[PDB]
């Protein structure tokens, strides 16, 4: 009889993981502050990693990697890509990004902006989407937050029929042994309003987020295109597959990002062990080139896929450490 | 990278290697708090002997 604690009840994924563990009849849930646990399904903020692996007679495991926020915060991710020799500095799969502080690298941001002025081409950026630099350089002081000015993808891949914009979400599990498991099912979070490039001010066509646009459910359920349907579209409209044109680049980005932070976050020789589920957010352009946008520390799964992924988390991340009395993942070999 | 202040002898040697440059209470006050604790003990014992006398 293994024991676990739940310290984040706003977590959609680990609410399903908890009930799946209890249903086996080999796991018992304890109260929040009980130190005598095998597994910790931990809080998002201020997780007490310093208290783990100090209980004699208990192998202790947590569903978060300490230091993984360095990949999962927008400001931190830019600093990581720019400084680390594995990714530095003209990264082919990451858009041109600059860290901006309100009262910093905004004196060198203008130098590249003037290259975009002298060489007369597209000069659209994201923060909300701006037209010119000086018009939203005071917008960081307007909100009072440290946000990033990233290059906006002016020429993206457009779904037909609809002339639409989309982002791809991939769910990745890193176990205690630092195996990188990519879940075979991903989701396309689609825009319903046709993409407009003449003026960027309207919210529906430009922003790709699920929560904001709620047009809704026109082409598919809750603006969510799954992997079998999207592969089929590419076969018909572009004469290519998902794995060739898009997914190989996705696998390359995931593996490059996590192998970079491996020495800093690995729990290989530690007194406690970690796994973590990540949410990688991608963008595909007209020439079928995949770009990284966001990495999520606490990602929420798609409604259709909860049952399969949460069983997968129990299978290879939990039951590997604590064994009970075909695989849905693609292992990314390094 | 830079090995400085190298000093050698028969027993061994010492040096510094730099990779990157940078970017009380009184004697009376002690005896006071000790005697304040002794009097608190003596009061607690007095309250006990009072209770036992009753």
């Amino acid at each position: 009889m293994y024991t676990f604690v739940v310290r984040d009840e706003n977590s959609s994924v680990y609410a399903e993981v908890s009930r799946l563990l209890l249903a086996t009849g080999q796991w018992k849930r304890l109260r929040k502050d009980n130190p005598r646990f095998n597994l910790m399904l931990g809080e998002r903020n201020r997780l007490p990693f310093g208290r783990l692996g100090h209980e004699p007679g208990l192998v202790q495991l947590v569903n978060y990697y300490r230091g993984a926020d360095k990949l999962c915060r927008k400001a931190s991710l830019v600093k990581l890509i720019k400084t680390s020799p594995e990714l530095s500095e003209s990264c082919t799969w990451f858009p041109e990004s600059y860290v901006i502080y309100p009262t910093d690298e905004r004196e060198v941001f203008l130098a590249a902006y003037n290259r975009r002025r002298e060489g007369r081409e597209g000069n659209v950026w994201i923060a909300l989407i701006s037209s010119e630099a000086s018009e939203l350089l005071d917008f960081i002081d307007e909100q009072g937050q440290v946000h990033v000015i990233q290059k906006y993808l002016e020429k993206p891949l457009l779904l037909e029929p609809g002339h639409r914009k989309f982002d791809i979400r991939s769910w990745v599990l890193v176990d205690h042994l630092y195996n990188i498991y990519l879940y075979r099912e991903g989701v396309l979070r689609t825009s319903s309003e046709p993409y407009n490039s003449a003026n960027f001010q309207d919210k529906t066509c430009h922003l790709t987020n699920h929560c904001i646009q709620k047009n809704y459910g026109r082409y598919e359920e809750g603006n969510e295109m799954f992997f079998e349907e999207f592969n089929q579209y590419l076969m018909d409209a572009l004469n290519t597959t998902l794995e060739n044109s898009i997914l190989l680049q996705i696998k390359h980005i995931i593996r490059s990002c996590l192998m970079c932070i491996e020495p800093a976050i690995s729990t290989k020789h530690l007194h406690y062990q970690s796994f973590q589920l990540f949410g990688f957010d991608f963008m595909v352009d007209e020439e079928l080139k995949v770009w990284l946008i966001e990495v999520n520390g606490a990602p929420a799964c798609a409604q259709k896929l909860y049952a399969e992924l949460c069983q997968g988390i129990v299978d290879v991340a939990i039951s590997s450490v604590f064994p009970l009395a075909t695989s849905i993942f693609i292992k990314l070999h390094h | 990278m830079e090995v400085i202040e190298l000093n050698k002898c028969t027993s061994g040697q010492s040096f510094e290697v730099i990779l990157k440059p940078p970017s009380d209470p009184s004697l009376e006050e002690i005896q006071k708090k000790l005697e304040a604790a002794e009097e608190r003990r003596k009061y607690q014992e007095a309250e006990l002997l009072k209770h036992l006398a009753e």
Partner: protein
């Protein structure tokens, strides 16, 4: 030459003192009776070892050590043990009734009746010193004597010896090793009262030593003897520079300079490699690169914590054996590229290296094998605050219900001292977080 006085308080401090002084004697070639045949100046001198040993006309080498316990039984084993002649009877002070795992009983009650006697026996050693530099204090955080009496002594030593440096070797409590339940209380109370009186403190978590003994020495249930022989090796590494010819850490003041930029943050992490079983039949001798690399494995540290998630303020490497600067610098360059070593912006990223050519001496019939080269790293990392966080949480849980408090109040201590100690610890944890992130 400047002499050093060692103070051993409570059971933990005394038995560790025994382990260290046994090891020093084997290192300097001093016999159980106190004779040192290699020493040519009979009945005096100003050599490097004379920092720790004084001399009499008969050629006897006596430790500058005071042993203090509130109960006779442990020091009685020093009085009748194999090193009985080595110490003067006046150096070994015993009370009648112990502090019963109670800080307040050790500090206030039994503390008051013995403090003046101990300082007199300390003064009797200090009067034999041509130039005193300070004190090395050995105790547990957990025991009543170790916590209570030590903090009272440290207060008084600041009054009587204001110009002198004070170093701590402190045993941090572990449930695995015979722990009393109120030991988080004692640990917090002694840290608060000692924090301004201590210049540099080396924490040794019994948990870490217990696991090193299980993993690397193949001992299934480590005794105090198993733990102390390992602790004494680490202490010997740290003190070697005071006892031997060299140019790194030659005085106690240099420990503050090299390791402690911020006075309150005076808890350097010690990491030691290699620990090899004497029962191990075939052993491949480890290189300079391998042992220096092992200084960054958490499983080798004196406290289990993660230096990758923290910042360094200072880092010393102390080598014993066949080591040359070329191999050290090559090792460092390889480690820097592969491992997460982050310094604070107001500090140089760098290492102060000290080598002694004599390989570490091991106690005959002990558990540690002879090695060609060994290293102790001393690094002031913010990661060690993990140990404060663990201890504070345990304090918080008990104190919320006021559990066991009545035992402390019944010794004359006010309840307000508990919360005053905890606020200081909450401030200390915040200091580490400011520097660390």
């Amino acid at each position: 030459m400047r002499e050093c006085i060692s103070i051993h308080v409570g059971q933990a401090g005394v038995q560790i003192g025994n382990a260290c002084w046994e090891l020093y004697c084997l290192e300097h070639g001093i016999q159980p009776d106190g004779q040192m045949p290699s020493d040519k100046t009979i009945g005096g001198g100003d050599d490097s070892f004379n920092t720790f040993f004084s001399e009499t006309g008969a050629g006897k080498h006596v430790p500058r050590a005071v042993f203090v316990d509130l109960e006779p039984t442990v020091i009685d084993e020093v009085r009748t043990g194999t090193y009985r002649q080595l110490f003067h009877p006046e150096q070994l002070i015993t009370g009648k009734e112990d502090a019963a795992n109670n800080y307040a009983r050790g500090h206030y009650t039994i503390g008051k009746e013995i403090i003046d006697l101990v300082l007199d026996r300390i003064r009797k050693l200090a009067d034999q010193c041509t130039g005193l530099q300070g004190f090395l204090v050995f105790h547990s955080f957990g025991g009543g004597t170790g916590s209570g009496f030590t903090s009272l002594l440290m207060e008084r030593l600041s009054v009587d010896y204001g110009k002198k440096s004070k170093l701590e070797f402190s045993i941090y409590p572990a449930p695995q090793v015979s722990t009393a339940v109120v030991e988080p209380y004692n640990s917090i109370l002694t840290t608060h009262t000692t924090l301004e009186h201590s210049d540099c403190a080396f924490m040794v978590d019994n948990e870490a030593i217990y696991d090193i003994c299980r993993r690397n020495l193949d001992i299934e249930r480590p005794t105090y003897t198993n733990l102390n022989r390992l602790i004494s090796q680490i202490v010997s590494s740290i003190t070697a520079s005071l006892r031997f010819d060299g140019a790194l850490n030659v005085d106690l003041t240099e420990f503050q300079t090299n390791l402690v930029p911020y006075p309150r943050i005076h808890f350097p992490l010690a990491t030691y490699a290699p620990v090899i079983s004497a029962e191990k039949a075939y052993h491949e001798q480890l290189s300079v690169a391998e042992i220096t690399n092992a200084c960054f494995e958490p499983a080798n540290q004196m406290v289990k914590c993660d230096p990758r998630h923290g910042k360094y303020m200072a880092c010393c490497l102390l080598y014993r054996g066949d080591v040359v600067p070329k191999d050290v610098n090559a090792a460092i360059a390889t480690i820097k590229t592969k491992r997460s070593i982050q310094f604070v912006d107001w500090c140089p990223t760098g290492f102060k290296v000290g080598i002694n050519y004599q390989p570490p001496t091991v106690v005959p019939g002990g558990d540690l094998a002879k090695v060609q080269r060994a290293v102790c790293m001393l690094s002031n990392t913010t990661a060690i605050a993990e140990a404060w966080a663990r201890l504070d949480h345990k304090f918080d849980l008990m104190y919320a219900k006021r559990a066991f408090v009545h035992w402390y109040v019944g010794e004359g201590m006010e309840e307000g001292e508990f919360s005053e100690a905890r606020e200081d610890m909450a401030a200390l944890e915040k200091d580490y977080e400011e520097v660390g992130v």
